[PDB]
């Protein structure tokens with residue numbers, strides 16, 4: 233529900249964090265707080281791997297449009313910063329993170345999805361940075377998140393042309409790693425997480441950092457300079 | 465024709481620039497001048513998007529071989545510089561640029577094609593940097609153009625091995641973004657351009673620059689140091 | 697055989713170097729020495745292109761596990777250094793290098809494979825950096841080798857998740873360039889090498905260096921600092 237938008241469930245060697253705000257899983261302050269608290273739970277439980285899911289309608293429609301279009305600049309910037317901080321937290325997470333993309337993933341929803349080690353979606357789910365289409369220049373933090381995953385040509389189209397990807401085109405582009413039928417997206421993600429929990433955790437954590445260090449530093453710059461994009 | 469190699473046609477929200485020198489659309493001085501004048505026209509008309517096409521035989525066979533093999537170094541270097549300047553102009557263009565690859569695109573023809581935001585070709589059209597095959601080391605400006613679009617492994621083969629791509633292999637590699645039947649390549653490119661004209665133009669222009677800044681600077685270096693590759 | 701693990705055969709414009717230690721072509725000191733001596737032969741014979749093959753069981757199972765798990769640090773580090781030096785030698789080789797991946801390629805076997813200009817494998821052959829799975833953090837030299845060839849998303853999974861690729865997934869990822877049936881892998885590699893020998897050799901050598909300079913420097917750093925990864 234809107235006031236209780238995240239659930240946390242431990243299943244043996246994994247933890248499953250599910251977003252369902254009863255709508256489109258907007259990544260506002262309350263959702264970010266709930267997600268950070270759920271990841272805190274995973275930290276305390278020292279789980280072997282993390283699964284993050286959306287609901288039956290979407291993975292996430294991205295940042296909360298209401299806060300963005302409210303005329304109040306500061307809450308908007310804090311929300312953006314918190315969202316990209318969460319992305320940074322997941323990208324640098326010391327356990328394997330598997331995303332269960334259970335519906336469309338748009339804008340920050342797509343950026344968030346792109347922070348999983350392994351991403352599972354169904355063929356019919358749209359993944360898109362629609363920012364340019366609706367009149368927003370893509371923040372550097374979001375650009376660097378996408379740049380880490382998208383092929384060179386997909387990165388060009390996804391950004392400048394707000395291109396929509398799905399299924400085989402998303403897989404080819406690097407917006408997802410695996411396609412499954414809608415009814416087994418979550419199950420496949422859990423199965424994958426259980427497998428990755430069998431990897432050596434220390435080598436995994438060290439290796440993923442080595443494979444991402446440059447992007448993490450650029451994302452950090454994008455987070456810290458976010459206000460400056462808007463002249464604040 | 466050879467003396468009148470470019471046409472410019474405004475269609476509602478787009479402008480269509482067509483190369484047809486009656487042969488292989490060689491990118492010599494007269495062609496570059498005509499293309500720059502056509503883009504000047506688009507600038508004055510402030511169109512929503514640009515389509516650039518070849519003729520029924522090729523997109524372009526690249527730089528004019530006659531000028532290259534004439535024994536006169538300076539016209540050769542000026543032609544190269546002008547060609548890569550045109551590439552830079554298109555890559556940084558503030559409106560969406562759609563390439564209608566209406567036949568083969570070889571060497572500078574392929575480099576030029578790689579400057580469109582969206583590239584449409586038919587399955588049978590060869591796209592190739594044949595430089596290494598014919599005894600030329602690829603200029604840095606051309607390397608950086610390709611590096612921005614080609615997957616890591618395609619970039620290796622396209623350069624060092626002068627590999628030819630087409631259709632599905634070109635799409636996979638990042639030498640094109642869309643495949644269409646020969647008879648609708650131009651129509652599909654126009655349709656795409658009309659769509660992209662509906663994107664927010666300011667966000668598009670800003671975002672494409674952010675997504676290309678490093679490549680643009682490297683291409684600029686390649687242009688400015690072009691003479692130095694040949695010890696001049 | 698184990699004591700005579702490499703053969704060198706000149707065929708017209710190419711040389712064929714075949715690994716067969718009677719087992720899994722482990723890249724220990726004796727194998728590295730034999731390979732370097734075979735490449736020395738190719739240097740003296742000034743061949744048009746190089747083909748490197750495995751045996752009927754594998755391309756290579758990577759570094760010699762016995763030396764790695766012997767409790768003696770220095771032979772282990774020398775072996776690693778020599779292996780990555782060989783990789784560097786092949787990546788910077790002035791003639792086209794074609795890999796005939798005649799079976800699985802695991803860990804350094806996969807890193808070695810990734811040093812060919814053109815890589816041919818059969819659909820059933822596994823290619824995997826299994827380091828994270830078995831408890832090793834991937835060395836920087838190996839990371840940079842893979843980074844030069846793998847798509848952005850394949851690079852993430854191949855490293856942090858020790859993902860196994862094969863056939864179409866290897867081709868898509870950039871772990872190979874061509875798939876052939878097992879019985880013609882070597883023949884196809886030879887045919888390709890003969891073709892590449894027809895490229896202009898000077899332009900090939902210059903162009904491949906330009907297309908790899910950054911990676912070569914990073915690999916060199918990884919080689920020279922290899923001891924430092926282990927605090928030596």
Ligand SMILES: C[C@H](O)CC(=O)SCCNC(=O)CCNC(=O)[C@H](O)C(C)(C)COP(=O)(O)OP(=O)(O)OC[C@H]1O[C@@H](n2cnc3c(N)ncnc32)[C@H](O)[C@@H]1OP(=O)(O)O
Nearest residue numbers: 256258293294295296297298336338339340363366368371
């Ligand atoms: C850099 C940063 O990313 C900056 C930005 O945020 S730029 C803005 C990017 N965000 C968007 O444009 C929003 C994306 N939303 C969507 O694409 C679609 O709504 C969707 C695919 C998620 C859902 O599609 P669809 O099922 O057709 O539902 P749709 O009719 O569009 O809207 C569903 C409801 O959710 C609301 N909603 C949708 N997305 C929302 C969001 N991000 N925040 C708040 N509310 C949202 C709608 O206003 C509508 O509300 P209502 O039922 O109470 O009227």
Ligand SMILES: C[C@H](O)CC(=O)SCCNC(=O)CCNC(=O)[C@H](O)C(C)(C)COP(=O)(O)OP(=O)(O)OC[C@H]1O[C@@H](n2cnc3c(N)ncnc32)[C@H](O)[C@@H]1OP(=O)(O)O
Nearest residue numbers: 488490525526527528529530568570571572595598600603
């Ligand atoms: C860094 C820079 O890129 C440096 C360089 O330019 S390196 C040189 C790269 N360019 C080339 O090698 C040229 C590429 N050309 C081609 O690949 C092929 O000609 C093509 C695919 C474009 C056309 O193929 P095809 O239809 O078989 O025509 P083909 O017989 O080759 O030649 C067509 C005619 O155009 C000419 N021509 C072809 N390409 C030309 C070019 N770039 N400039 C001038 N003339 C050219 C031919 O000489 C022939 O002329 P003719 O009819 O008057 O004799």
Ligand SMILES: C[C@H](O)CC(=O)SCCNC(=O)CCNC(=O)[C@H](O)C(C)(C)COP(=O)(O)OP(=O)(O)OC[C@H]1O[C@@H](n2cnc3c(N)ncnc32)[C@H](O)[C@@H]1OP(=O)(O)O
Nearest residue numbers: 720722757758759760761762800802803804827830832835
């Ligand atoms: C950074 C660096 O890469 C650091 C590292 O080396 S980390 C370690 C990475 N290496 C490995 O884990 C080894 C990889 N090996 C394999 O994956 C598999 O053995 C293989 C696919 C190559 C062969 O599989 P399979 O046919 O099932 O044979 P398998 O039963 O595993 O072993 C075959 C035999 O070769 C041995 N062997 C396998 N790989 C070996 C290696 N790299 N070195 C030495 N011996 C090896 C086995 O111990 C066994 O020996 P035996 O017949 O005398 O008992």
